Design an enzyme around this catalytic site. Structure first.
Site, PDB file in Angstrom:
ATOM      1  N   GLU A  55       0.951   0.172  -5.088  1.00  0.00           N
ATOM      2  CA  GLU A  55       0.461   0.980  -5.714  1.00  0.00           C
ATOM      3  C   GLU A  55       0.744   2.451  -4.777  1.00  0.00           C
ATOM      4  O   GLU A  55       1.297   2.249  -3.859  1.00  0.00           O
ATOM      5  CB  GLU A  55      -1.164   1.284  -5.424  1.00  0.00           C
ATOM      6  CG  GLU A  55      -2.168   0.742  -6.277  1.00  0.00           C
ATOM      7  CD  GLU A  55      -3.052   1.148  -5.889  1.00  0.00           C
ATOM      8  OE1 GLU A  55      -3.887   2.613  -7.057  1.00  0.00           O
ATOM      9  OE2 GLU A  55      -4.266   1.616  -5.471  1.00  0.00           O
ATOM     10  N   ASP A  59       1.162  -1.019  -0.167  1.00  0.00           N
ATOM     11  CA  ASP A  59      -0.553   0.187  -0.156  1.00  0.00           C
ATOM     12  C   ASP A  59       0.782   1.242   0.176  1.00  0.00           C
ATOM     13  O   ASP A  59       2.041   1.267   0.402  1.00  0.00           O
ATOM     14  CB  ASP A  59      -1.178   0.271   1.215  1.00  0.00           C
ATOM     15  CG  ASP A  59      -1.442   1.153   0.992  1.00  0.00           C
ATOM     16  OD1 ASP A  59      -2.552   1.141  -0.127  1.00  0.00           O
ATOM     17  OD2 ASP A  59      -2.218   1.496   2.444  1.00  0.00           O
TER      18      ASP A  59
END
Ligand SMILES: OC[C@H]1O[C@H](O[C@H]2[C@H](O)[C@@H](O)[C@@H](O[C@H]3[C@H](O)[C@@H](O)[C@@H](O[C@H]4[C@H](O)[C@@H](O)[C@@H](O)O[C@@H]4CO)O[C@@H]3CO)O[C@@H]2CO)[C@H](O)[C@@H](O)[C@@H]1O
Ligand SMILES: [Ca+2]
Ligand SMILES: [Ca+2]
Ligand SMILES: [Ca+2]
Ligand SMILES: [Ca+2]
Ligand SMILES: [Ca+2]
Length: 1055
Positions: free
Chosen positions: A678, A649
């Site tokens: 991401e 993340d």
């Protein structure tokens, strides 16, 4: 020291209030810091206020609306400066103030003086400072007391601080036990170390590039940093007369790494089973004391052990009996916290915890290797899918899932396994049988949303009420409902689920009652995505049947085992090392920041405040001991839990070098581990090279690509209102089936198709295609909102998707964007056509759980806390959870009008559409794995084998035609059944005919032939001469069959 000056306050009283406002009055003091340094009485005649009423603040009675009027001079003044008495029409509200000398602003900031925060309407300000103070004393101690934390002790001898630039006295004061402050007379009596101006090192510059413009200061080579760092540390500057210039707190993470990290890195941490017993070790290089507190199973202190400090590392250790296995424990810290400015005493769980008590209140000694914590056969568990070669990795087809989303609703999962790791063992449930089907057709990996220990679910079952339980249970545990519009329902004897169903009847953009109730439910239910880390290396306890002690460890491995061994899929874990759930000395979930304050969090270089750009409490993976904790953590998940890969993340909040370091560490354990992440924001390039899509080119670290995603979905994540409908995607008919609102031009539509084609060839920076204008372009030359579009070196560095846990589901995007005349069956094909760009592309394929079921969240954009209700996935295939209430108004309120317009255009999918979508989906994934050609892995192999037809300004809009060459040129026949593959995705309402392969012996794939009337290619015609007619909204995979030798195939063209 004998000589040298004593730094002291100005020899003047701490000021009181000059006057106090009476009725219909407010009063402002200007604390003249410079004129408080006395000599002559300054003159305040040129001081004036500019005062005006607007809409935000309108309490003034005689505001002068002319900027050149400097007549609002002080009502009076004393030794501390002037003051103004301001008439008012009212005593509530606020006033607008600008403080001036002539027309020049002494404070370059419009001041909002609000009588709410300031009851007596008597405030003070200082020049160059936007703060509004309660009283002149407060403002005076602000100027002449310790403020902020802009000094940076960055290694042993180097201290960076602007506040000491070109000033005669600059020093580093310190107090072991109390908060540095002027003494009874007014002097700074505490011990200090003198600082000399210097120039920043090349190593300090390399380490801290965002600080290398700070004025540098040298420390004595003999300074004892061990002793300085034991308590409050405060850098102070002063004039020639010893009067205090400024005084600020010190950030020390730099020096802590310079001093201790080398030694501390060679040590292992946590409660560690050895041959002699159990070694406890925690890193606390600033703590005054660490005692190890041992607890009984019922949480009574049964022993308390002062730990041994290693002075080289700042680590604390203690060794005890192997009978401590299973014991609960905490560290009782005695440690100065710069935020509170006090020496705190509190107990903290182990940041290296590997087992926990219920709700993470205590950590627990555990030997993860115990056969008692393993399912039978665990030691022999193997990856069902290889991940060794790039071609192995390109076959990865990910299904992104959540523990509650999987089973919360499945009546065919035993009631007690619902929302639990163990639901994946319920071999006859609808959910597990559905996943088995998906795996058999070519879904290869389950990606799990946070299953480490998150903070935002209460693991005490008795303080939780879920929608399957009585509404009266919800009233017991959520006191807020009793005083809410739904209070009458406490008597109903019906479940919360049953209630929410009844609320659908009258629910509307004017009466969002389903969402209104659900907001309360969300506070006390079991549901959260979990991007809220409490401990990084223990499983979440609420997903265990029993969250007390070690049960969750065996339940977790039992889940992992069923996924690999019974479903046949690899497992990826979402990990969230970019932030912590909380920081500071008081919050229950602040762990790292209680043990080593201000080291593990990323801080504002000026205020010392914990930054929140991630959402929450930003972490500092650029710091060596957090880098170690991350790598150690992943080592455990890798080795002890057999996790096949990790998705980071907000990975771009991490240094590229840190992420590559963790990767080399984990590959030493298992070479096949896959790392990806991401990212979009960060704004951390000033501190280090971030781990971004652009910087990761060539590293083999994968990243989610938002290029194909936005081109196929349409628009972007921050669209709202009508833009949600105007910004049609390739998958929803941009340019070819416009809705009533869009103004998408043909050029724009064709731009989306360039991004989509690029993505289907792995989004490589150097892939060369023909663009929307017939121009030859490298992938990096296709624009994406300013950035280069193609950014990768191999397709395995790119994760394509069209739906994810965050933002609207694919189906909800199609519902926003599809023209009124697209019927329900056409929208199902739009979903499949959309997903086909991902599944038949060279990038790693990623998808949200339930896209094969047309998953809907009732237009919810951000469902992290939207409960079982809006996140429902119905494995009994009755519906897709569409139209179950307006979404949460706090986030989608601005979308209620556009939602009301679009929502009821066609029926809600039922069992017929869901089964059809799933067949389409399995068809797509079986195609993806039917040939090595779809998953070449290597970016140079992609370039030599992958091309596109139907390109240029006169392309048939929305027809995607890709060729993959298995012919004599480029290389050898990686595929013995075919000499080439044609992928045709006709995202359009018109039937289209392809002539590019006339005479070529082309034929439809056996998979699509087998599916017959159920195929995405149903109705496709291949004529005798090799022309191909494609139905509207179809996907066709065609192959040139291969003979006794290797044919000519589909040679790529050199452009
Ligand atoms: O009650 C009216 C308003 O009063 C206050 O506005 C002040 C400003 O605070 C002063 O700084 C000044 O404004 C200058 C301005 O600083 C100057 O740059 C120029 O503005 C330019 C602007 O830079 C440019 O972007 C473009 O828009 O052209 C502008 C001029 O057309 O000129 C201004 C005039 O001196 O004086 C005004 C006085 O009105 C207060 O801050 C406001 O909130 C308030 O509404
Ligand atoms: Ca006051
Ligand atoms: Ca938890
Ligand atoms: Ca919740
Ligand atoms: Ca910054
Ligand atoms: Ca071949």
């Amino acid at each position: 020291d004998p000589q040298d000056v004593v730094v002291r306050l100005p020899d003047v009283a701490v000021p009181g209030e000059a006057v106090q406002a009476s009725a219909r009055q407010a009063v402002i003091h200007l604390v003249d810091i410079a004129g408080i340094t006395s000599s002559t009485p300054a003159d305040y005649a040129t001081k004036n206020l500019y005062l005006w009423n607007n809409e935000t603040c309108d309490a003034l009675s005689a505001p002068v609306a002319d900027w050149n009027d400097v007549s609002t001079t002080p009502t009076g003044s004393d030794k501390y400066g002037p003051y103004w008495v301001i008439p008012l029409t009212k005593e509530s509200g606020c006033i607008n103030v600008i403080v001036r000398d002539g027309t020049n602003k002494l404070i370059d900031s419009d001041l909002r003086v609000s009588f709410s925060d300031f009851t007596d309407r008597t405030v003070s300000v200082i020049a160059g400072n936007s703060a509004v103070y309660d009283s002149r004393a407060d403002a005076f101690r602000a100027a002449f007391g310790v403020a902020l934390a802009d000094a940076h002790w960055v290694d042993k001898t180097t201290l960076l601080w602007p506040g000491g630039e070109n000033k005669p006295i600059v020093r580093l004061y310190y107090s072991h036990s109390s908060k540095v402050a002027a003494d009874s007379n007014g002097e700074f009596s505490d011990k200090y170390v003198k600082l000399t101006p210097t120039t920043v090192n090349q190593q300090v510059s390399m380490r801290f590039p965002h600080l290398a413009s700070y004025p540098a200061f040298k420390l004595p080579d003999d300074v004892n940093v061990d002793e300085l760092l034991q308590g409050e540390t405060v850098a102070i500057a002063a004039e020639s007369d010893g009067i205090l210039s400024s005084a600020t707190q010190v950030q020390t993470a730099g020096v802590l790494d310079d001093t201790y990290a080398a030694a501390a890195e060679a040590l292992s941490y946590g409660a560690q089973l050895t041959d002699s017993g159990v070694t406890f070790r925690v890193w606390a290089p600033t703590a005054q004391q660490v005692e190890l507190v041992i607890y009984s199973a019922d949480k009574k202190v049964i022993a308390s052990h002062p730990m041994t400090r290693d002075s080289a590392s700042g680590a604390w250790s203690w060794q005890g009996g192997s009978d401590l296995k299973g014991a609960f424990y905490r560290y009782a810290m005695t440690v100065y916290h710069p935020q509170s400015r006090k020496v705190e005493q509190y107990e903290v769980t182990d940041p290296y915890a590997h087992s926990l008590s219920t709700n993470s209140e205590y950590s627990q000694v555990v030997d993860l290797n115990d056969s008692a914590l393993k399912p039978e056969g665990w030691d022999g568990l193997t990856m069902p899918h290889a991940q060794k070669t790039k071609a192995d990795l390109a076959k990865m087809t990910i299904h992104e899932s959540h523990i509650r989303d999987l089973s919360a609703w499945d009546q065919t999962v035993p009631a007690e396994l619902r929302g639990k790791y163990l639901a994946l063992t319920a071999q006859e449930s609808n959910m597990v049988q559905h996943l088995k089907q998906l795996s058999a057709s070519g879904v290869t990996h389950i990606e799990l949303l946070p299953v480490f220990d998150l903070a935002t679910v209460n693991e005490f079952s008795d303080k939780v009420a879920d929608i399957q339980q009585p509404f009266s249970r919800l009233c017991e545990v959520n006191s807020a409902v009793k005083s809410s519009e739904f209070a009458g329902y406490c008597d109903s004897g019906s479940t919360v689920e049953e209630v929410l169903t009844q609320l659908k009847q009258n629910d509307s953009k004017d009466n969002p009652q389903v969402q209104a109730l659900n907001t309360l439910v969300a506070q006390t239910d079991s549901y959260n995505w979990g991007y809220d880390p409490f401990h990084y290396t223990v499983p979440e306890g609420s997903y265990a049947t029993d969250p007390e002690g070690t049960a969750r460890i065996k339940e977790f491995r039992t889940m992992i085992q069923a996924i690999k061994q019974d479903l046949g899929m690899n497992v990826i874990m979402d990990v969230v090392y970019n932030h912590t759930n909380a920081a500071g000395p008081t919050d229950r979930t602040s762990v790292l920041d209680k043990i080593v304050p201000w080291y593990y969090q990323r801080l504002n270089e000026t205020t010392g405040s914990v930054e929140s750009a991630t959402c929450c409490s930003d972490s500092a993976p650029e710091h060596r001991m957090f880098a170690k904790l991350i790598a150690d953590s992943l080592a455990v998940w890798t080795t002890d839990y057999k996790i096949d890969g990790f998705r980071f993340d907000l990975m771009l909040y991490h240094p590229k070098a840190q992420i590559l370091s963790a990767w080399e560490r984990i590959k030493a354990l298992n070479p096949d581990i896959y790392f990806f992440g991401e990212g979009w924001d960060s704004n951390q390039s000033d501190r280090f090279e971030i781990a971004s899509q652009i910087n990761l080119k060539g590293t083999g670290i994968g990243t989610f690509s938002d290029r194909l995603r936005d081109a196929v979905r349409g628009g972007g994540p921050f669209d709202s209102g009508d833009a949600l409908r105007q910004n049609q995607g390739v998958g929803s008919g941009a340019g070819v089936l416009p809705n009533e609102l869009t103004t998408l031009s043909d050029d724009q539509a064709r731009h989306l198709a360039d991004l989509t084609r690029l993505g289907m060839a792995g989004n490589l920076a150097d892939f060369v295609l023909i663009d929307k204008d017939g121009a030859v372009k490298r992938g990096s030359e296709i624009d994406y909102n300013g950035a280069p579009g193609g950014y990768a070196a191999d397709p395995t560095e790119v994760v394509n998707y069209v739906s994810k846990h965050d933002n609207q589901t694919l189906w909800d995007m199609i519902s926003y964007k599809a023209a009124q005349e697209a019927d329900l069956d056409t929208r199902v094909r739009m979903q499949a056509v959309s997903l086909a760009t991902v599944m038949l592309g060279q990038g790693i394929a990623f998808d949200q759980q339930g896209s094969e079921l047309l998953r809907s969240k009732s237009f919810t954009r951000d469902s992290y806390d939207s409960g079982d209700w809006f996140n429902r996935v119905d494995y009994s295939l009755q519906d897709n959870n569409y139209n179950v209430g307006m979404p949460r108004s706090s986030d989608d309120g601005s979308n209620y009008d556009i939602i009301a317009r679009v929502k009821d255009a066609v029926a809600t999918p039922g069992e017929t559409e869901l089964k059809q979508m799933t067949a389409f989906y399995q068809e797509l994934t079986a195609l993806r794995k039917s040939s090595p050609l779809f998953t070449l892995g290597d970016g140079a192999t992609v370039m030599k084998r992958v091309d596109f037809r139907n390109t240029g300004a006169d392309q048939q809009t929305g027809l995607l035609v890709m060729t993959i060459d298995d012919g004599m040129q480029a290389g050898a026949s990686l595929d013995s059944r075919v000499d080439g593959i044609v992928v045709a995705i006709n995202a359009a309402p018109e039937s289209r005919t392809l002539q590019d392969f006339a005479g070529t012996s082309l034929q439809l794939s056996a998979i699509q032939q087998a599916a017959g009337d159920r195929s995405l290619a149903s109705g496709v015609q291949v004529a005798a001469d090799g022309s191909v007619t494609l139905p509207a909204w179809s996907v066709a995979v065609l192959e040139l069959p291969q003979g006794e030798s290797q044919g000519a195939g589909l040679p790529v063209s050199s452009k």
